[PDB]
Design a protein around this nucleic acid. Structure first.
Lengths: 46, 46, 116, 193, 144, 147, 115
RNA sequence: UCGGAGAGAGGCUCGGUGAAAUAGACAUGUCUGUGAAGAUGCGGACUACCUGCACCUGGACAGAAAGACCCUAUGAAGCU
RNA sequence: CGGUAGGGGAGCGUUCCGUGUUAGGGAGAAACGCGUGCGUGAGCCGCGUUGGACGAAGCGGAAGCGAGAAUGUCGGCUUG
RNA sequence: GGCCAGUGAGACGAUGGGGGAUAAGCUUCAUCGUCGAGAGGGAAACAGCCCGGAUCACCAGCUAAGGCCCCUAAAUGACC
RNA sequence: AGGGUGAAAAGAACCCCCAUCGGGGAGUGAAAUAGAACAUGAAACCGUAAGCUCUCAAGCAGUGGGAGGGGGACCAGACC
């Protein structure tokens, strides 16, 4: 359970950039919702 | 059983390369006839 | 595994889920338009369609089951005097699940219930 | 603006033609062009090949006919061409070798009792998967893995023998589908096959 | 310095973590003020709102300090750095105590108008270099 | 503080293409040295020598700067058509050379350490080398061996 | 008589500057910068003696591969048979260099070794 | 035997806050052999595209903690 | 003219002191960072759109005088 | 002799033996070789086995031990 | 345990973002990259931009050779 050693700058920038790329994937969805929130007949967002 | 395995440095007196051919021990290096001595490596020219 | 278990259970235990259903469909029948989460929205949709069509046939037995389900006294008797005059000929589909922005603090998918 | 990428790309190719020089092949070639004696001292250092010396387009192509040829000496003389140790341009760090083609893999001779006693066993990672498999079983089943197993242990199994492993083209049929560079037959120096 | 093109806006050590500010700041890089205006209206992050406050107070800065428009204005770099980290000695069981660090950011966002010349043709002229200083202000692949 | 402007001198671009196409390419001819080639033996090691080349070698025992020095220990002198295979030295041979100023080459850090037996030695070595420029090769017109 | 100093940082900054392009904490982290200076210098030793040995090996196999292109069984050993019997003192395996820079001249070498 | 289903709190995902023991640097395969006699690091062969997520803990002689057992100290102390 | 435990000889560096209110220095000292330079090396010398007031060499002396290790120790910041 | 240190745990290999079971990479001695304190080459790897004693440079040559099919330098060398 | 903005608070009038904190102009100053966390600011650590390069690959991450590519260049063969 206890880690034997530490990680490099290598593997850490890989994992942190996979985390922040996983943050990248959930804003073109927000760009699509922000673009559909604009002028148009949409039956949502009262 | 009663046969001892040959361990390290007894493995080396047994399994080292030994050239046990009485011909190939007799070999000396080849002899070419002697040549005259080569001239000077360079010369002062004034 | 959940093959074909079509009950929609929330993040609450069973009796607390029943009280959430009864209270939120009660105040849904009080105000008409309401802000829920989407799980709470569909969970309101089934039961409030059951309560619109329950007092559609305004007998005493339907009125007593309907008064037994809903908390408030004076809202069941404001219901069967309203649902045959309004929701006759609709034949199902008494609500609308207009969604909105997520909630600040949870990113909870937040919905909004009509009566149409 | 497609003309930015296209026209500036062709300007970069244009100054690639103007600044840089081509690399002449090593055939009927003297020591130096008079430009080359002004350039680097490529004489007193060991000759190292450039990218225009090991192009896979103008490599040689060899065809042996493995009918009644013994396996291991054929594998060694295919290896000595698959490295490039019959060329004076041999550098053991680049791919100076030559493509070879081995037709008739189904009729490869062996000497002694190889056919019933030599095993091509293999194993996956889990225990109890060691596959009992003898020479006649592959030669009945897939013969072009025989020679392909013989020469794969003849090449330096790093990143570079793995690259010249694909130069081997073994086919079990009597005819190979290659008409690449008109493949000249392979020269042998083995008097005992 | 780009000859008077960019607008640099710094930020206080705001009371949140640097890494989530770096995913929300690595989203909005390269996109202009309208797209970040509509995305940061609706991004589901708590680190979204001071970033949107600094973009809004950065382009309003770019329209009041300079005199630009909020449509031809792309985010240039938007770098987020570390700040001061507080230390919180929080007790935990079996007589132990853990340092819980309260992290702060340091946001510096640079904005970029397009103040262009848009020359007619490409063809090089190796004459009058004291005009070649002014005619070429921001291009690519500088030879010699 | 503004975008600067368009500048209006009303220029006309010269598209004659007889000045820029003269300016951008360069005409530089290599000097034709001659069609000759030797292999000298200096110290112990042999050098490919062509007339005009800034070679490096060993001699710093004694040799004055800018001196005119004949390297008469020549084997395998070769022209464009024929070479002269040297039974050891080609006779009456003379590679005329210019021994130039003496140099020290790059540092070769000879640092030795064994293991935990705590021993380490940083020493350095500047080899006393000599750069030689080559003038021309002569005295080589005996026993041709062209093929 | 306090003696706080800076000489460990110049002592250490020189070794820091030598350890460039060492791929990670061998290029940044001081307590490995030292042992990569050390192991890099002994790597320079053994690879220098074995670059003498290794280029000897490379010229041997290069001129062997040049001589074996005749087809008739003339090995590299027989080229030295009739390279020292016909008295050519010590061409120093630079005929493996002009064997590719001047292949007609090495054909003149070998074709005069035959005669 | 011989398990099976269901309800909660965790676990999984999202949004907030956010540690810890550990850590020479880690570009951190399997078999087999060798070696301070139990090797990802040495040798030969075979096998493996890179990198995550969720579980399991066989190894890293895993973490702890200058072995309570054994012995040594011209050690300490209690007791007889 | 390999070298552990170890012995001897010769040197570099640091801060202060004598020369010294030294030469030099807001026309940029010390610092910090840099080298296509020199040394057997400890190091010197030179260059800096950074910095802003001190301080060399030579000939000498004195040390809280040189760091990679002490489950060292004190601050800073990582890993997980 | 003067001044002044370490070391006093050794290990394997050949021979001469004792203890053992003429068992142990076992234990104790006597002469010697190596390692310790010894790099390089051969021994696949591998302190003690063979050659061999590393001041340094060379993109120099000849050899010892050992090798000359390929991986990997040199003979798919010759004759019994 | 926590010292040092300037020489002098001359400590930022006024405009914009704006609930503040903060930020940008302007103004003071020789210096505002001396802005109150304020004097030189190094390493670990976290980043962003530019050049080359990694997704059939076994490696104490080097070193010797160096394919291909990039940069300034002047002893254009050199250097990184």
């Amino acid at each position: 359970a206890v880690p034997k050693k530490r990680t490099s700058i290598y593997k850490k920038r890989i994992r942190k950039n996979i985390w922040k790329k996983k943050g990248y994937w959930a804003a073109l969805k927000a760009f699509s919702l922000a673009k559909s929130l604009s002028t148009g007949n949409s039956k949502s967002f009262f | 059983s009663s046969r001892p395995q040959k361990k390290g440095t007894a493995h080396h007196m047994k399994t080292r390369p030994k050239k046990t051919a009485r011909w190939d021990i007799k070999r000396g290096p080849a002899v070419y006839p002697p040549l005259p001595p080569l001239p000077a490596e360079w010369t002062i020219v004034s | 595994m959940k093959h074909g278990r079509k009950i929609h259970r929330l993040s609450r235990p069973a009796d607390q889920r029943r009280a959430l259903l009864r209270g939120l469909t009660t105040q849904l029948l009080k105000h008409g338009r309401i802000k829920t989460t989407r799980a709470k929205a569909s969970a309101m949709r089934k039961y409030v369609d059951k309560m619109i069509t329950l007092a559609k046939e305004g007998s005493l037995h339907k009125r007593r089951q309907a008064l037994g389900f809903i908390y408030e006294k004076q809202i069941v008797h404001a219901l069967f005097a309203e649902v045959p005059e309004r929701y006759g000929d609709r034949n199902g589909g008494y609500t609308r699940i207009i969604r909105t922005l997520p909630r600040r603090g949870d990113n909870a998918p937040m919905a909004y219930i009509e009566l149409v | 603006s497609t003309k930015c990428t296209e026209e500036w790309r062709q300007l970069k190719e244009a100054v690639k033609k103007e600044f840089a020089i081509p690399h002449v092949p090593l055939d009927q070639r003297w020591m130096f062009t008079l430009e080359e004696a002004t350039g680097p001292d490529i004489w007193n250092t060991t000759w190292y090949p450039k990218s225009a010396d090991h192009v896979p387009t103008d490599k040689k192509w060899y065809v042996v006919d493995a009918t009644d040829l013994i396996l291991g000496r054929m594998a060694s003389t295919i290896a000595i061409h698959i490295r490039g140790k019959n060329l004076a341009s041999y550098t053991p760090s680049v791919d100076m070798g030559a493509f070879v083609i081995v037709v008739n893999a189904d009729k490869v001779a062996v000497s002694g009792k190889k056919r019933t006693q030599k095993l091509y066993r293999r194993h996956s990672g889990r225990p109890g998967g060691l596959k009992e498999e003898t020479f006649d079983q592959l030669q009945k089943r897939i013969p072009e893995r025989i020679i392909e197993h013989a020469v794969r242990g003849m090449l330096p199994k790093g990143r570079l023998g793995r690259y010249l492993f694909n130069h081997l083209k073994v086919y079990k049929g009597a005819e190979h589908p290659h008409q690449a560079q008109q493949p000249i037959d392979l020269p042998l120096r083995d008097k005992r096959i | 310095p780009g000859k008077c093109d960019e607008i640099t806006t710094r930020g206080y050590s705001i009371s949140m973590s640097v890494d989530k500010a770096r995913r929300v700041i690595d989203q909005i890089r390269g996109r202009s003020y309208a797209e970040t205006l509509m995305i940061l209206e609706l991004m589901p992050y708590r680190a979204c709102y001071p970033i949107f406050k600094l973009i809004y107070s950065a382009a309003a800065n770019a329209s009041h300090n300079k005199q630009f428009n909020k449509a031809n204005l792309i985010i240039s770099k938007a770098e987020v750095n570390k700040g001061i980290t507080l230390k919180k000695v929080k007790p935990r069981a079996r007589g132990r105590s853990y340092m819980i660090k309260r992290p702060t950011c340091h946001i510096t966002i640079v904005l970029r108008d397009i103040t262009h010349f848009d020359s007619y043709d490409k063809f090089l002229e190796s004459l009058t270099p004291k005009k070649l200083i002014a005619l070429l202000g921001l291009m690519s692949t500088g030879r010699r | 503080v503004l975008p600067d402007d368009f500048q209006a001198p009303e220029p006309g671009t010269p598209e004659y293409n007889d000045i820029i196409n003269q300016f951008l390419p360069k005409k530089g001819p290599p000097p034709p040295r001659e069609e000759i080639f030797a292999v000298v033996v200096i110290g112990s090691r042999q050098y490919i020598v062509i007339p005009g080349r800034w070679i490096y070698t060993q001699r710093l025992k004694g040799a004055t700067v800018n001196d005119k020095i004949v390297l008469n220990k020549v084997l395998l002198v070769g022209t464009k058509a024929s070479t002269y295979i040297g039974t050891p030295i080609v006779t009456n041979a003379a590679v005329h050379a210019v021994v130039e100023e003496q140099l020290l080459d790059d540092k070769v850090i000879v640092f030795k350490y064994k293991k935990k037996k705590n021993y380490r030695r940083n020493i350095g070595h500047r080899q006393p080398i000599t750069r030689i420029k080559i003038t021309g090769i002569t005295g080589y017109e005996d026993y041709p061996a062209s093929t | 008589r306090v003696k706080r100093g800076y000489i460990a940082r110049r002592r250490r900054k020189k070794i820091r500057f030598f350890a460039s392009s060492f791929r990670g904490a061998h290029s940044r982290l001081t307590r490995t910068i030292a042992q990569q200076k050390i192991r890099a210098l002994v790597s320079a030793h053994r690879d220098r003696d074995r670059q003498k040995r290794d280029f000897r090996r490379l010229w041997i196999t290069r001129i062997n591969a040049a001589i074996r292109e005749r087809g008739v069984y003339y090995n590299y050993s027989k080229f030295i048979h009739d390279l020292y019997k016909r008295q050519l003192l010590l061409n120093r395996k630079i005929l493996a260099q002009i064997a590719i820079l001047n292949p007609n001249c090495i054909y003149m070498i070998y074709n005069e070794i035959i005669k």
